Design an enzyme around this catalytic site. Structure first.
Site, mmCIF file in Angstrom:
data_model
loop_
_atom_site.group_PDB
_atom_site.id
_atom_site.type_symbol
_atom_site.label_atom_id
_atom_site.label_comp_id
_atom_site.label_asym_id
_atom_site.label_seq_id
_atom_site.Cartn_x
_atom_site.Cartn_y
_atom_site.Cartn_z
ATOM 1 N N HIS B 52 0.901 -1.435 0.031
ATOM 2 C CA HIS B 52 -0.146 -0.100 0.010
ATOM 3 C C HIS B 52 0.903 1.276 -0.056
ATOM 4 O O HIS B 52 2.139 1.358 0.370
ATOM 5 C CB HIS B 52 -0.784 -0.169 1.170
ATOM 6 C CG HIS B 52 -2.042 -0.970 0.819
ATOM 7 N ND1 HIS B 52 -3.226 -0.951 1.876
ATOM 8 C CD2 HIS B 52 -2.378 -2.087 0.255
ATOM 9 C CE1 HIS B 52 -4.138 -1.911 1.771
ATOM 10 N NE2 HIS B 52 -3.466 -2.506 0.388
ATOM 11 N N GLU B 54 1.135 3.805 2.053
ATOM 12 C CA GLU B 54 1.578 3.992 3.482
ATOM 13 C C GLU B 54 2.745 3.202 3.599
ATOM 14 O O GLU B 54 3.771 3.662 4.441
ATOM 15 C CB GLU B 54 0.404 4.137 4.298
ATOM 16 C CG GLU B 54 -0.577 5.089 4.120
ATOM 17 C CD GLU B 54 -1.899 4.569 3.128
ATOM 18 O OE1 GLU B 54 -1.569 3.643 2.259
ATOM 19 O OE2 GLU B 54 -2.992 5.248 3.175
ATOM 20 N N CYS B 82 -5.791 1.702 5.685
ATOM 21 C CA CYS B 82 -6.652 0.546 6.390
ATOM 22 C C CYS B 82 -5.940 0.061 7.438
ATOM 23 O O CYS B 82 -4.954 0.515 8.087
ATOM 24 C CB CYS B 82 -6.372 -0.456 4.936
ATOM 25 S SG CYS B 82 -4.784 -1.209 4.985
ATOM 26 N N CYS B 85 -2.177 -0.547 7.417
ATOM 27 C CA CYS B 85 -1.416 0.441 7.123
ATOM 28 C C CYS B 85 -1.529 1.363 8.329
ATOM 29 O O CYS B 85 -0.441 1.878 8.841
ATOM 30 C CB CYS B 85 -1.676 1.345 5.984
ATOM 31 S SG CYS B 85 -1.348 0.847 4.520
#
Ligand SMILES: O=c1[nH]c(=O)c2ncn([C@@H]3O[C@H](CO)[C@@H](O)[C@H]3O)c2[nH]1
Ligand SMILES: O=c1[nH]c(=O)c2ncn([C@@H]3O[C@H](CO)[C@@H](O)[C@H]3O)c2[nH]1
Ligand SMILES: [Zn+2]
Ligand SMILES: [Zn+2]
Lengths: 157, 157
Positions: B52, B54, B82, B85
Protein backbone atom coordinates in the site's frame (compact mmCIF):
# COMPACT_ATOMS: atom_id res chain seq x y z
CA UNK A 1 0.55 -31.32 9.84
CA UNK A 2 -0.19 -28.29 12.01
CA UNK A 3 2.50 -29.11 14.57
CA UNK A 4 5.23 -29.56 11.95
CA UNK A 5 4.68 -26.15 10.33
CA UNK A 6 4.17 -24.37 13.67
CA UNK A 7 7.48 -25.83 14.86
CA UNK A 8 9.12 -24.63 11.64
CA UNK A 9 7.85 -21.11 12.35
CA UNK A 10 9.29 -21.35 15.86
CA UNK A 11 12.63 -22.48 14.41
CA UNK A 12 12.54 -19.47 12.09
CA UNK A 13 12.10 -17.27 15.16
CA UNK A 14 15.12 -18.80 16.91
CA UNK A 15 17.20 -18.52 13.72
CA UNK A 16 16.38 -14.86 13.16
CA UNK A 17 17.29 -14.06 16.75
CA UNK A 18 20.57 -15.96 16.43
CA UNK A 19 21.67 -14.19 13.23
CA UNK A 20 20.59 -10.73 14.40
CA UNK A 21 17.92 -10.31 11.71
CA UNK A 22 15.22 -9.22 14.16
CA UNK A 23 13.03 -10.40 16.99
CA UNK A 24 11.87 -13.92 17.92
CA UNK A 25 9.02 -14.26 15.43
CA UNK A 26 8.60 -16.70 12.57
CA UNK A 27 6.01 -17.35 9.89
CA UNK A 28 5.54 -20.22 7.43
CA UNK A 29 3.09 -20.14 4.53
CA UNK A 30 2.06 -23.51 3.07
CA UNK A 31 -0.03 -24.72 0.12
CA UNK A 32 -1.56 -28.15 0.80
CA UNK A 33 1.42 -29.22 2.96
CA UNK A 34 4.06 -27.74 0.64
CA UNK A 35 6.04 -24.82 2.06
CA UNK A 36 5.76 -21.72 -0.10
CA UNK A 37 7.52 -19.37 2.32
CA UNK A 38 9.57 -19.66 5.51
CA UNK A 39 10.55 -16.39 7.17
CA UNK A 40 11.36 -14.60 10.41
CA UNK A 41 11.29 -10.98 11.55
CA UNK A 42 13.67 -8.82 9.48
CA UNK A 43 13.10 -5.37 11.02
CA UNK A 44 16.72 -4.96 12.11
CA UNK A 45 18.19 -6.57 8.99
CA UNK A 46 16.14 -4.42 6.60
CA UNK A 47 15.78 -1.24 8.69
CA UNK A 48 12.06 -1.72 8.04
CA UNK A 49 9.54 -1.71 10.92
CA UNK A 50 6.98 -3.33 8.59
CA UNK A 51 9.22 -6.38 8.04
CA UNK A 52 7.52 -8.53 10.66
CA UNK A 53 7.79 -12.28 10.08
CA UNK A 54 4.23 -12.52 8.73
CA UNK A 55 4.57 -9.62 6.28
CA UNK A 56 7.92 -10.96 5.08
CA UNK A 57 6.41 -14.40 4.52
CA UNK A 58 3.46 -12.92 2.63
CA UNK A 59 5.75 -10.89 0.36
CA UNK A 60 7.91 -13.94 -0.35
CA UNK A 61 4.95 -16.27 -0.95
CA UNK A 62 3.39 -13.75 -3.31
CA UNK A 63 6.66 -13.48 -5.26
CA UNK A 64 7.07 -17.27 -5.32
CA UNK A 65 3.58 -17.83 -6.77
CA UNK A 66 3.66 -14.67 -8.95
CA UNK A 67 0.35 -13.38 -7.59
CA UNK A 68 -0.99 -11.05 -4.90
CA UNK A 69 -3.65 -13.37 -3.41
CA UNK A 70 -2.99 -16.56 -1.44
CA UNK A 71 -6.54 -17.89 -1.08
CA UNK A 72 -5.40 -21.53 -1.31
CA UNK A 73 -2.66 -21.09 1.31
CA UNK A 74 -2.42 -21.22 5.10
CA UNK A 75 -0.09 -19.32 7.44
CA UNK A 76 1.59 -20.52 10.64
CA UNK A 77 2.82 -17.80 12.98
CA UNK A 78 4.98 -18.58 16.00
CA UNK A 79 3.22 -15.77 17.86
CA UNK A 80 -0.21 -14.11 17.53
CA UNK A 81 0.03 -11.65 14.61
CA UNK A 82 -0.09 -7.95 15.46
CA UNK A 83 -2.73 -5.58 13.96
CA UNK A 84 -0.49 -4.75 10.99
CA UNK A 85 0.18 -8.41 10.25
CA UNK A 86 -3.43 -9.48 10.73
CA UNK A 87 -4.51 -6.74 8.32
CA UNK A 88 -1.89 -7.95 5.84
CA UNK A 89 -3.14 -11.53 6.26
CA UNK A 90 -6.64 -10.24 5.49
CA UNK A 91 -5.48 -8.44 2.34
CA UNK A 92 -3.53 -11.50 1.12
CA UNK A 93 -6.69 -13.69 1.28
CA UNK A 94 -4.92 -16.48 3.19
CA UNK A 95 -7.64 -18.95 4.09
CA UNK A 96 -6.38 -20.08 7.51
CA UNK A 97 -4.11 -18.85 10.31
CA UNK A 98 -2.57 -21.11 12.95
CA UNK A 99 -0.61 -19.34 15.66
CA UNK A 100 1.42 -20.63 18.58
CA UNK A 101 1.75 -18.13 21.42
CA UNK A 102 -0.67 -15.47 22.59
CA UNK A 103 0.48 -11.87 22.19
CA UNK A 104 0.83 -11.53 25.97
CA UNK A 105 3.87 -13.83 25.78
CA UNK A 106 5.67 -11.24 23.62
CA UNK A 107 4.35 -8.30 25.66
CA UNK A 108 5.77 -9.91 28.81
CA UNK A 109 9.33 -9.67 27.44
CA UNK A 110 9.02 -6.02 26.40
CA UNK A 111 7.05 -5.65 23.14
CA UNK A 112 4.14 -3.24 22.74
CA UNK A 113 0.67 -3.98 24.03
CA UNK A 114 -0.45 -3.98 20.39
CA UNK A 115 -3.21 -6.54 19.84
CA UNK A 116 -5.53 -7.14 16.87
CA UNK A 117 -9.21 -6.83 17.83
CA UNK A 118 -10.29 -8.56 14.61
CA UNK A 119 -8.27 -11.68 15.46
CA UNK A 120 -9.72 -11.95 18.97
CA UNK A 121 -13.25 -11.26 17.74
CA UNK A 122 -13.72 -7.77 19.23
CA UNK A 123 -13.52 -5.78 15.99
CA UNK A 124 -16.32 -3.54 14.75
CA UNK A 125 -14.97 -2.02 11.51
CA UNK A 126 -12.58 -4.89 10.74
CA UNK A 127 -14.25 -8.28 10.49
CA UNK A 128 -12.05 -11.22 9.56
CA UNK A 129 -13.51 -14.30 7.93
CA UNK A 130 -10.45 -16.56 7.74
CA UNK A 131 -10.31 -19.62 9.96
CA UNK A 132 -8.12 -19.12 13.04
CA UNK A 133 -6.59 -21.79 15.29
CA UNK A 134 -4.73 -21.11 18.52
CA UNK A 135 -2.35 -24.00 19.16
CA UNK A 136 -2.74 -26.15 22.28
CA UNK A 137 -0.52 -28.57 24.16
CA UNK A 138 3.03 -29.06 22.92
CA UNK A 139 2.66 -26.40 20.22
CA UNK A 140 1.60 -23.76 22.73
CA UNK A 141 4.41 -24.85 25.07
CA UNK A 142 7.11 -24.54 22.37
CA UNK A 143 5.76 -21.21 21.09
CA UNK A 144 5.50 -19.74 24.59
CA UNK A 145 8.99 -20.98 25.46
CA UNK A 146 10.44 -18.97 22.54
CA UNK A 147 10.18 -15.74 24.54
CA UNK A 148 11.70 -17.11 27.75
CA UNK A 149 14.57 -18.69 25.81
CA UNK A 150 15.44 -15.62 23.72
CA UNK A 151 14.80 -13.04 26.48
CA UNK A 152 17.88 -10.81 26.10
CA UNK A 153 19.43 -12.29 22.95
CA UNK A 154 18.10 -9.51 20.68
CA UNK A 155 17.57 -5.75 20.54
CA UNK A 156 13.99 -4.66 21.18
CA UNK A 157 12.05 -2.63 18.61
CA UNK B 1 1.66 22.98 5.05
CA UNK B 2 -1.14 20.44 5.53
CA UNK B 3 -2.83 21.37 2.25
CA UNK B 4 0.47 21.22 0.34
CA UNK B 5 1.49 17.73 1.49
CA UNK B 6 -2.05 16.34 1.28
CA UNK B 7 -2.18 17.61 -2.31
CA UNK B 8 1.17 15.93 -2.98
CA UNK B 9 -0.31 12.67 -1.68
CA UNK B 10 -3.33 13.05 -3.98
CA UNK B 11 -1.09 13.71 -6.99
CA UNK B 12 0.91 10.60 -6.08
CA UNK B 13 -2.38 8.68 -6.15
CA UNK B 14 -3.17 9.90 -9.66
CA UNK B 15 0.42 9.26 -10.78
CA UNK B 16 0.43 5.68 -9.54
CA UNK B 17 -2.87 4.82 -11.15
CA UNK B 18 -1.78 6.50 -14.40
CA UNK B 19 1.42 4.45 -14.61
CA UNK B 20 -0.24 1.19 -13.56
CA UNK B 21 1.73 0.74 -10.33
CA UNK B 22 -1.41 0.18 -8.26
CA UNK B 23 -4.58 1.82 -7.00
CA UNK B 24 -5.32 5.52 -6.49
CA UNK B 25 -3.57 5.92 -3.13
CA UNK B 26 -0.71 8.20 -2.18
CA UNK B 27 1.32 8.81 0.95
CA UNK B 28 3.95 11.45 1.75
CA UNK B 29 6.27 11.32 4.77
CA UNK B 30 7.66 14.67 5.91
CA UNK B 31 10.39 15.62 8.41
CA UNK B 32 9.96 19.22 9.63
CA UNK B 33 8.76 20.46 6.20
CA UNK B 34 11.30 18.26 4.32
CA UNK B 35 9.78 15.44 2.27
CA UNK B 36 11.49 12.17 3.19
CA UNK B 37 9.37 9.92 0.97
CA UNK B 38 6.61 10.41 -1.61
CA UNK B 39 4.99 7.19 -2.81
CA UNK B 40 1.85 5.53 -4.11
CA UNK B 41 0.32 2.06 -4.01
CA UNK B 42 2.66 -0.46 -5.65
CA UNK B 43 0.62 -3.66 -5.21
CA UNK B 44 0.46 -4.35 -8.95
CA UNK B 45 4.01 -3.26 -9.79
CA UNK B 46 5.57 -5.25 -6.92
CA UNK B 47 3.13 -8.20 -6.91
CA UNK B 48 2.86 -7.41 -3.20
CA UNK B 49 -0.50 -6.95 -1.44
CA UNK B 50 1.25 -5.27 1.52
CA UNK B 51 2.70 -2.55 -0.76
CA UNK B 52 0.00 0.00 0.00
CA UNK B 53 1.01 3.64 -0.38
CA UNK B 54 1.53 4.11 3.36
CA UNK B 55 3.65 0.97 3.88
CA UNK B 56 5.73 1.86 0.80
CA UNK B 57 6.36 5.36 2.16
CA UNK B 58 7.35 4.01 5.58
CA UNK B 59 9.76 1.49 4.04
CA UNK B 60 11.39 4.14 1.84
CA UNK B 61 11.63 6.78 4.58
CA UNK B 62 13.16 4.34 7.07
CA UNK B 63 15.73 3.14 4.53
CA UNK B 64 16.59 6.74 3.62
CA UNK B 65 16.96 7.91 7.24
CA UNK B 66 18.75 4.71 8.42
CA UNK B 67 16.36 4.34 11.37
CA UNK B 68 13.32 2.17 12.06
CA UNK B 69 11.45 4.87 14.03
CA UNK B 70 10.05 7.96 12.29
CA UNK B 71 9.07 9.74 15.51
CA UNK B 72 10.19 13.11 14.07
CA UNK B 73 8.10 12.62 10.91
CA UNK B 74 4.46 12.96 9.87
CA UNK B 75 2.53 11.03 7.23
CA UNK B 76 -0.01 12.41 4.76
CA UNK B 77 -2.33 9.79 3.25
CA UNK B 78 -4.61 10.59 0.33
CA UNK B 79 -7.10 8.12 1.84
CA UNK B 80 -7.83 6.91 5.39
CA UNK B 81 -5.26 4.16 6.07
CA UNK B 82 -6.55 0.60 6.20
CA UNK B 83 -6.01 -1.65 9.28
CA UNK B 84 -2.67 -2.96 7.99
CA UNK B 85 -1.40 0.55 7.21
CA UNK B 86 -2.58 1.99 10.51
CA UNK B 87 -0.72 -0.84 12.25
CA UNK B 88 2.36 0.03 10.20
CA UNK B 89 2.02 3.73 11.12
CA UNK B 90 1.89 2.72 14.79
CA UNK B 91 4.94 0.47 14.52
CA UNK B 92 6.95 3.15 12.68
CA UNK B 93 6.38 5.63 15.57
CA UNK B 94 5.19 8.37 13.20
CA UNK B 95 4.00 11.23 15.38
CA UNK B 96 1.12 12.54 13.24
CA UNK B 97 -1.25 11.34 10.52
CA UNK B 98 -3.18 13.62 8.16
CA UNK B 99 -5.52 11.94 5.69
CA UNK B 100 -7.77 13.30 2.97
CA UNK B 101 -10.74 11.08 2.18
CA UNK B 102 -12.76 8.73 4.35
CA UNK B 103 -12.42 5.00 3.70
CA UNK B 104 -16.02 4.93 2.45
CA UNK B 105 -15.01 6.84 -0.69
CA UNK B 106 -12.74 3.94 -1.67
CA UNK B 107 -15.28 1.33 -0.55
CA UNK B 108 -17.84 3.03 -2.81
CA UNK B 109 -15.89 1.98 -5.92
CA UNK B 110 -15.55 -1.65 -4.79
CA UNK B 111 -12.63 -1.87 -2.35
CA UNK B 112 -12.93 -4.04 0.78
CA UNK B 113 -15.19 -2.87 3.62
CA UNK B 114 -12.00 -2.94 5.67
CA UNK B 115 -11.61 -0.13 8.21
CA UNK B 116 -9.16 0.39 11.08
CA UNK B 117 -10.93 0.17 14.44
CA UNK B 118 -7.96 1.82 16.16
CA UNK B 119 -8.17 4.86 13.88
CA UNK B 120 -11.89 5.38 14.54
CA UNK B 121 -11.54 4.58 18.27
CA UNK B 122 -13.81 1.52 18.22
CA UNK B 123 -11.48 -1.17 19.58
CA UNK B 124 -11.36 -3.17 22.78
CA UNK B 125 -7.70 -4.19 22.56
CA UNK B 126 -6.03 -1.86 20.03
CA UNK B 127 -5.98 1.76 21.16
CA UNK B 128 -4.17 4.68 19.56
CA UNK B 129 -2.92 7.98 20.96
CA UNK B 130 -1.39 8.96 17.60
CA UNK B 131 -2.29 12.50 16.60
CA UNK B 132 -4.80 12.01 13.78
CA UNK B 133 -6.24 14.79 11.61
CA UNK B 134 -8.95 14.26 9.01
CA UNK B 135 -8.65 17.13 6.55
CA UNK B 136 -11.70 19.25 5.75
CA UNK B 137 -12.78 21.71 3.08
CA UNK B 138 -10.47 22.13 0.09
CA UNK B 139 -7.88 19.38 -0.05
CA UNK B 140 -10.46 17.05 1.46
CA UNK B 141 -12.94 17.60 -1.38
CA UNK B 142 -10.19 17.05 -3.95
CA UNK B 143 -9.06 13.91 -2.10
CA UNK B 144 -12.60 12.52 -1.98
CA UNK B 145 -13.06 12.92 -5.73
CA UNK B 146 -10.03 10.68 -6.50
CA UNK B 147 -11.97 7.42 -6.55
CA UNK B 148 -14.75 8.56 -8.87
CA UNK B 149 -12.10 10.11 -11.11
CA UNK B 150 -9.97 6.95 -11.39
CA UNK B 151 -12.33 3.98 -11.01
CA UNK B 152 -12.24 2.95 -14.68
CA UNK B 153 -8.45 3.35 -14.93
CA UNK B 154 -7.37 0.31 -12.89
CA UNK B 155 -8.40 -3.16 -11.73
CA UNK B 156 -9.58 -3.70 -8.16
CA UNK B 157 -7.40 -5.78 -5.85
O1 LIG C 1 3.30 -10.13 14.27
C1 LIG C 1 4.37 -9.77 14.65
N1 LIG C 1 5.54 -10.11 13.89
C2 LIG C 1 6.83 -9.66 14.36
O2 LIG C 1 7.79 -9.94 13.72
C3 LIG C 1 6.96 -8.84 15.63
N2 LIG C 1 8.03 -8.32 16.22
C4 LIG C 1 7.59 -7.68 17.33
N3 LIG C 1 6.26 -7.81 17.42
C5 LIG C 1 5.47 -7.20 18.50
O3 LIG C 1 5.09 -8.19 19.43
C6 LIG C 1 3.90 -7.74 20.12
C7 LIG C 1 2.88 -8.86 20.20
O4 LIG C 1 2.28 -9.12 18.94
C8 LIG C 1 3.43 -6.47 19.40
O5 LIG C 1 3.91 -5.33 20.12
C9 LIG C 1 4.17 -6.55 18.06
O6 LIG C 1 4.39 -5.31 17.42
C10 LIG C 1 5.84 -8.52 16.36
N4 LIG C 1 4.50 -8.98 15.89
O1 LIG D 1 -4.33 2.29 3.07
C1 LIG D 1 -4.47 1.85 1.98
N1 LIG D 1 -3.43 2.02 1.01
C2 LIG D 1 -3.62 1.48 -0.31
O2 LIG D 1 -2.74 1.61 -1.10
C3 LIG D 1 -4.90 0.74 -0.68
N2 LIG D 1 -5.27 0.17 -1.82
C4 LIG D 1 -6.50 -0.33 -1.61
N3 LIG D 1 -6.89 -0.07 -0.36
C5 LIG D 1 -8.19 -0.49 0.18
O3 LIG D 1 -9.07 0.61 0.18
C6 LIG D 1 -10.08 0.40 1.20
C7 LIG D 1 -10.24 1.66 2.02
O4 LIG D 1 -9.15 1.86 2.92
C8 LIG D 1 -9.66 -0.85 1.98
O5 LIG D 1 -10.37 -1.97 1.47
C9 LIG D 1 -8.18 -0.98 1.62
O6 LIG D 1 -7.65 -2.29 1.72
C10 LIG D 1 -5.90 0.60 0.25
N4 LIG D 1 -5.72 1.15 1.62
ZN1 LIG E 1 3.15 -8.01 12.97
ZN1 LIG F 1 -3.40 0.12 3.74
Amino acid sequence: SDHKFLTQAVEEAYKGVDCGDGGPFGAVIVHNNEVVASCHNMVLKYTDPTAHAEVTAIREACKKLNKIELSECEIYASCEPCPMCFGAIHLSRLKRLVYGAKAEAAIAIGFDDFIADALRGTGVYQKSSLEIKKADGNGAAIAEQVFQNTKEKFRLY
